[PDB]
Structure formats: C-alpha cells, structure tokens
Assembly symmetry: C3
C-alpha cells in the first residue's frame, strides 16, 4: 500500500517521523497487510486553499492492491486525519483523503510487478 | 473536487495565491459544485521535462466525484492552462491536465466518506 | 505519457537532468509513443518510509492513454527503478512504481483534450 500526505505546513523531520509512523501502522492495520509492503511519505506543498480559505488544510492519497472499500476507507481516513491534526495542527475537517484501488499488474516493486 | 498544480517555477506565494483563486473558481464553475468543497494547491517540483525539452512546463491533476466528462474536462483544462500561462509564464501547450472520476466511497473529508 | 518520481533524496539538478533523460527515453520506448508527448519530473519529498524503515526509498507514478499492461509496466518499472538506483543511490527493491491507464477524454494538453 501507499500513503502520501500533501500539506503546506513546514513540518520538522521529527513531526514528520512521528506522523509517518502513525500513518504506516494505521494503513497496515486497516488493510490487513504487512508493514513491509507499506510506503508512506510527506510532501510540503506551496500554498493550498480549501473552501475558498487559505487556512491550513491537507490532502492525502492512499492506494492499495485491493482492500479499498467504503468501511475500510472510512477507517483509514479517520486515523490519518486524526494523526495530521495531532502532528500538524490541521483541523481534520480540512483534510481530504482519496482512495485508489490498483490491479496487481499496475503495481511494481523494483523490476517486478505484483 | 481537488486540483493540484505541479510546476518547476519558483512562484512567489502571491503569484500562487492569485493562481489558486483563479483555479478554485474555474473548477467550482465547470463542475457546478460549491466552492466550500473545492481544494486547490501548488507544488514546486524539482526539474521537469516535456517533449525532450527542459523549457518550462506543468502538469495538473484534477479529481471530482462525478462531473468528469470530455466537455467539462476541456473547459477546466482551458481555464487552468490559461491561468498558469498568465501567472507562471508557462506556455499553455506545455501543460498537461489529467482528470480522475472518483466514487463517493473513495473520498473522505476528515473521518467521513462521501 | 507522464512519469513523476517522488523521493526524499536531495538530488542536484544535474543528477535530476540525467535521471529524467533516462526516464523519458524508457517511457517513450516501452509505450511506443513519440518523445514529444512524454512529460517527466522529479519531486523531492520530505521524509519517506517503506517497510517500517527510513532508509532511502522512492515512488514513481506513470500514466498513459493506453499501453498500460502487465508486460509493458514491468519493462518501464525495470528501467525506471534501475535509473533511480544509478542516479540517486536508492535500492531498486525500495522503489514502488504504479501505473494508471487514462481515457483520451481524461487527458488535456493546453485547452484541448485527446
């Protein structure tokens, strides 16, 4: 699985480390996949707006080979939004999380597809 | 809806503010969705190449729950490309815009899916 | 086609230039599409983790209008992973490459869809 967080907040690598540790656990747990297959990252964007406001907001992209369902997506979004609020100060209601189901052939690690 | 612009141009936050204001309006207008649900951002990439040239270029990703159609995508791309040209100096013919239709269950705000 | 590489490595623009030249050629070759239509970029992320480790890793997103298949994806991933290893020092087995097939109507260049 993959989880990438995009946010204008200038997070210190130590905020980022704690956030990403929370993120990887939540994604592995919800999808029932080994942590060894979970990739997570933080990317500081330039400016971001949401609802016509420059107030802090975030968006996160999560992808998996299967496991993408209404219930599981909601679980992941709840956990990820809460972690961003905790670590970045971004209100959870200003965080969009979107989910993408990938076919095994659409996902490679090194020189091999799944 | 979501619109994220990726470009190597070192845009000043004030270029970015004006760009993103143009972007949010164009996306809301084309999709007939309230501005309150529109998220927009700018991300300065490292190097980008297009057509084998390092000349300035950009790519933008736009996602929505429904509303993704040939006519509507063309309208959004016309408006977004033009805004990047105006605010960033990037020729519109060196801007790729790609569109993604999301199911409601694939999109969360805070701890709730749509 | 589009290929975007996300990695925490602080690559010098000259590492980036060489990487992206390798990337554009490999994508054009595998998909049998003209270089004129290939867009490539590098984005230095903040922190990234993979498998519960902060050791260097990367993820790359590749999109095309058609041409996305198990064999072709594997070819592209092999070439891209190898280039990142060569130019960035990131072990190829710590690189995820994911593939997205786009409809022509979902892809615009300037003010026109494909």
């Amino acid at each position: 699985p993959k989880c990438m967080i995009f946010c204008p907040v200038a997070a210190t690598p130590a905020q980022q480390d704690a956030l990403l540790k929370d993120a990887e656990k939540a994604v592995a747990d919800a999808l029932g996949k080994p942590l060894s297959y979970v990739m997570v990252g933080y990317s500081q964007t330039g400016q971001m707006r949401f609802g016509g406001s420059s107030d802090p907001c975030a968006f996160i992209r999560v992808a998996s080979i299967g496991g993408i369902t209404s219930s599981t997506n909601c679980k992941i979004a709840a956990a990820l939004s809460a972690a961003c609020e905790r670590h970045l100060g971004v209100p959870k209601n200003r965080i969009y999380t979107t989910f993408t189901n990938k076919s095994p052939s659409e996902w490679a690690m090194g020189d091999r597809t799944f």
